[PDB]
């Protein structure tokens, strides 16, 4: 057809790109399996390959309740995942520290929920145990951590007890606790996972690695004492002894990635908004901090603000949502300006220096509490050139664990 033969090349390779852009489903969709009194999920994971490529893992997931209870069968919706992989420098073994932030979304909105859901209310210790055989290569993984459903948080430390792990850690991530997802109140009756809980659910998967082998897994996620347990049997077949997986061509982490430390800071900051520590930030709660700083956003101005970062459009922001809005990277001239603007909030009289009382007003309006000696000591920490107060330079080189 008509158009520049340049126009046509590009238009063809915009729609091919487009297809791959639409095909990259980041979310994890949940459907019901009422006949199986359960749920399923079919999703893909893109594992970065060392040489720029990508190894994708086609996941096919089935879930069922172990017990005979009532269970909540959910409508179509999705989980939303943010994973952070790291190492403990103390730990000497082949291992992984894994942090997940899982939030539920997908639905536009007495009360109820599940009994089984009152068990996630606070922090739950986690035990994970995995038994696999990949292409004959046998290994065991073990680990502990905790789950904090309110901030959709999961933290684990996973050891390979049998010594060297014969597959890359990334590939085991999905396998080694969706009951730690934050289901927003407005859909807390689509949380199959907690509902099935105390007796628990089976989570079976087949993961197809493109041009490489497959993993089969069957796991029981149930309570033992008050430890939430994830116990797995993993069987892998079809894998070339030198594909990305068995040859370890897969990479651990990206590199622009949030440290465990940073995420902790973002949690503490989230708490500053979440006055009632109920895991969400409301228009009310946002207003309170805003006014406290000295602004007057209207009910509507707040609702907008939130609705612009509130994935599940329920009017509140939960920690993964917050964590997401903080995890966006910017054109570092926007980031720079963000810092310039943060500075001007701290530097209240706008004289270009943050004083001790200026630092105190900000932390105080933020709902922190502070001894004069802590204030004076913070200023000590930032006051490089030692003039008793903090300029823009000092603020920048003090603000950078972004
Ligand atoms: Ca709250
Ligand atoms: Ca929300
Ligand atoms: Ca000042
Ligand atoms: Ca200074």
Author numbering: 1 to 109, 122 to 188, 192 to 417
Reproduce the article's own wording on this structure:
Crystallization condition B (see Experimental Section) was used to generate a Ca2+-saturated crystal of another high-contrast Ca2+ sensor variant, Case12. The 3D-structure of Case12 at high Ca2+ concentration (Case12 structure B) was refined to a 2.6 Å resolution and revealed that the binding mode of the M13-peptide to the CaM-domain was similar to the recently reported Ca2+-saturated dimeric crystal structures of GCaMP2. Case12 structure B is a dimer in the asymmetric unit where the M13-peptide is bound to the CaM-moiety of the neighboring molecule. In contrast to the Case16 structure A, both lobes of CaM are bound to M13-peptide of a neighboring sensor molecule. As was expected for the Ca2+-saturated form of the sensor, all four Ca2+-binding pockets of CaM are occupied by Ca2+ ions. In contrast, at high concentration (16 mg/mL) in presence of 1 mM Ca2+ a second distinct molecular mass of about 90 kDa was observed indicating dimerization for both sensors. Therefore the detected fluorescent response of the sensor within the whole range of the monitored Ca2+ concentrations is induced by its monomeric form rather than its homodimer. The obtained Case12 structure B most probably resembles the non-functional homodimer and should not be interpreted as an example of the active Ca2+-saturated state of the sensor. Similar data were reported earlier for GCaMP2 Ca2+-saturated dimeric form. As shown in our light-scattering experiments, the formation of such a homodimer is favored at high sensor protein concentrations that could potentially be achieved locally in living cells with high sensor expression levels.
